[PDB]
Amino acid sequence: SHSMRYFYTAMSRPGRGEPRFIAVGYVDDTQFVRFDSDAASPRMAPRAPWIEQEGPEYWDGETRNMKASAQTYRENLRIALRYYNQSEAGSHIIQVMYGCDVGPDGRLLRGHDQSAYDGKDYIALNEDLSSWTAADTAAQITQRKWEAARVAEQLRAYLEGLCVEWLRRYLENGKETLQRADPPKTHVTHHPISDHEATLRCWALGFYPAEITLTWQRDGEDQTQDTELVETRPAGDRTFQKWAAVVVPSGEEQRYTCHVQHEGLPKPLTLRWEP
């Protein structure tokens, strides 16, 4: 089961020029394209090796789409000011995410299109792909305009069509990474805090995709409520890192076990501090 997601951000900045427009594209947890209007030669550009084989008509066409989208989103920022009776002196932000999820057979599971204005929910295409949920009176104005202009049907056509078709293409072209789970490299470190207590830290490094479970047990009792668990973070090389730590009484260290669950591991993994 897989996903393709585009994230567009438009940010006004009065006194500092026209609004900035940034778009990024992901397949699952892998970024594969970007566009930034503040780039020297602003264009859609590759961010994963398996999209680089796309020809110049792909890049020219995507760049065309992004420039037209930037223009429309800038218009939309101005419209939002009217809807909310806001001044042209404030900076504001539109965020939009859209895309498709497919199952293991490649059929469309779900389409997405939802947005925020200044970080608050604005309007979202419903799962039926034919109706909208509007969060406030401003978005209700948009809802009516979009019903009139048959926006949902055209979006539905994209989500059920090109979105799924191109996702399938990407998944095949990048199968050696996108459909190849990379298990974490794991180890446990030990750090005395005093003569009476120590930190045990369980590391999971270089894994893909991001979803993982990292837990400490004491005598086979779960310690999640006593565990410091950091947010999963990008390694910088398209893989991820995470760790979980517990402070333990000196002498109890061999009673603690770290448990790692990940798609790239055939079985639950169990680790201890190896002195």
């Binding site: 778009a23 792909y58 789409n65 989208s69 429309t72 104005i141 979009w146 055209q154 994209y158």
Partner: peptide
């Protein structure tokens, strides 16, 4: 591939 619906005003 991004959508070619690029004209939509709110």
């Amino acid at each position: 591939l991004t959508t070619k619906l690029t004209n939509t005003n709110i």
